[PDB]
């Protein structure tokens with residue numbers, strides 16, 4: 001879903017995504033990291 | 049009939065070399081046979097170029113086909129202009145009028161300048177490296193002055209590939225200072241994809257951005273990763289895969305053994321490679337015409353040393369160069385023809401826009417016709433001029449005092465005329481005021 | 485290339501000379517390879533070539549500063565290719581960050597048969613945008629012309 005969004009350009013500022021699982025940092029995030037859209041998610045494993 | 053020629057290839061130009069070999073077999077005849085001695089060299093290094101040339105000279109070649117960097121080209125145009133050695137290249141045109149250099153690459157500057165007035169740009173950002181000279185950048189700076197353009201030229205080639213990230217943000221902050229949306233890319237094909245990739249990541253490839261790729265190979269690189277972005281991408285093609293000549297070429301090309309002809313297993317070929325294939329045909333017709341005109345050209349001995357003092361050119365160099373420059377043939381890059389300096393003339397350049405279903409020609413450019421759009425107009429432009437009927441009554445609809453000199457909607461004035469505007473404005477349509 | 489080798493064959497220990505934008509690479513690559521040291525008053529290399537002792541100091545930094553001192557924002561930059569468009573790019577690279585409107589008119593390609601005409605055709609062409617601030621960037625002779 002990410003890659004598809006990336007290619008049609010729905011990851012710029014104004015857009016906003018909330019990833020609904022306990023593994024936000026379990027998957028790739030670099031490919032949306034600088035686009036402009038807002039990404040949110042949940043982490044159940046605190047590395048700190 | 050053993051004719052010796054010089055071959056100068058840069059390390060890792062594999063497809064260009066394979067194309068050179070298919071050209072060998074295809075245009076080889078039984079009248080004569082071109083015997084190519086190949087020199088694999090770091091074309092950027094001038095020392096190695098000077099050496100490799102002197103080697104080809106001392107062996108006794110009749111002409112050299114090769115490439116050059118802009119850093120190296122001067123060594124080439126010197127040793128060729130001096131020793132009358134003929135040089136054939138798909139590399140970029142020389143800054144001026146150099147003799148004994150047969151530049152297969154068509155001049156691109158004239159094409160690009162046409163396209164800019166076509167899209168009617170007035171303010172853009174020109175990005176570049178120096179690797180093909182700055183003779184193009186001079187062209188966009190002398191034009192901008194004469195046609196009122198504001199150009200933000202940024203040199204993006206000196207960027208180190210070791211810290212190649214902070215250099216891009218600060219680049220697109222300076223390119224966000226004037227909200228620059230129109231950008232030209234005049235770069236090495238490698239540098240092209242690196243920039244595109246970065247542009248995708250920061251999301252400057254949606255609707256509202258319009259990029260122009262300044263090279264002879266539009267469909268050469270990768271286009272699919274900004275094909276759905278929304279941004280419109282234009283560029284130039286010198287290899288038309290619709291020509292039956294090129295189409296028949298592709299069939300054998302795409303099917304060759306790849307262990308033997310590397311990078312030749314594709315449905316597309318780089319223009320750098322394609323020109324090399326065209327260059328072989330020219331080298332054949334050149335030496336064919338030299339015997340059909342019964343002119344003798346064989347070496348009267350060793351060329352010995354290229355640094356021989358004083359330098360004395362062999363005679364037939366004048367004759368050979370002329371033969372080359374008088375060639376007219378048809379190959380992969382459309383029609384081929386030269387002037388007295390070895391520059392392309394009368395050549396076609398396809399204009400391609402990136403769409404949804406892939407790259408697409410919207411027209412072609414000639415050095416004589418300038419910008420010509422192929423009659424492929426679409427029916428999409430609705431522009432349904434909504435016919436608005438009205439009556440000649442005061443003060444609803446009235447003729448203006450000098451309606452004669454005026455035309456269209458401007459002829460009439462009045463309440464309903466003013467209303468016709470407010471209606472069409474809020475409803476969004478172009479309309480024609482006509483009396484019943 | 486012939487002169488450099490002629491000097492080298494004799495076994496000189498160093499070489500003093502001048503070069504051009506259409507010959508600099510030759511001097512460098514043959515001095516980088518043969519480790520011959522070159523001492524030049526000519527314009528410095530657009531890089532980090534070794535064995536080349538450039539006597540003239542880098543100007544680039546100074547000119548940029550002086551323009552900033554005069555508080556300019558829109559000017560014309562007549563340039564000569566003869567010394568390598570390094571400085572032309574230096575002000576062009578800065579044109580964004582410093583916010584400049586630079587008109588870059590090449591001038592190192594005119595002939596002395598129509599010298600008096602083209603030079604007037606340039607200035608009666610900047611009577612268009614009506615700029616008054618110019619930079620010359622030329623070998624002294626192209627200045628006086």
Ligand SMILES: *[C@@H]1O[C@H](CO)[C@@H](O[C@@H]2O[C@H](CO)[C@@H](O)[C@H](O)[C@H]2NC(C)=O)[C@H](O)[C@H]1NC(C)=O
Pocket residue numbers: 376382383385394395
């Ligand atoms: C200039 O280029 C044109 C178009 O590439 C060349 O035109 C072709 O000429 C041949 C031989 O007369 C015809 O068979 C073709 O039909 C033409 N191709 C076209 C028009 O697409 C022409 O040869 C070149 N002119 C000169 C003076 O060299």
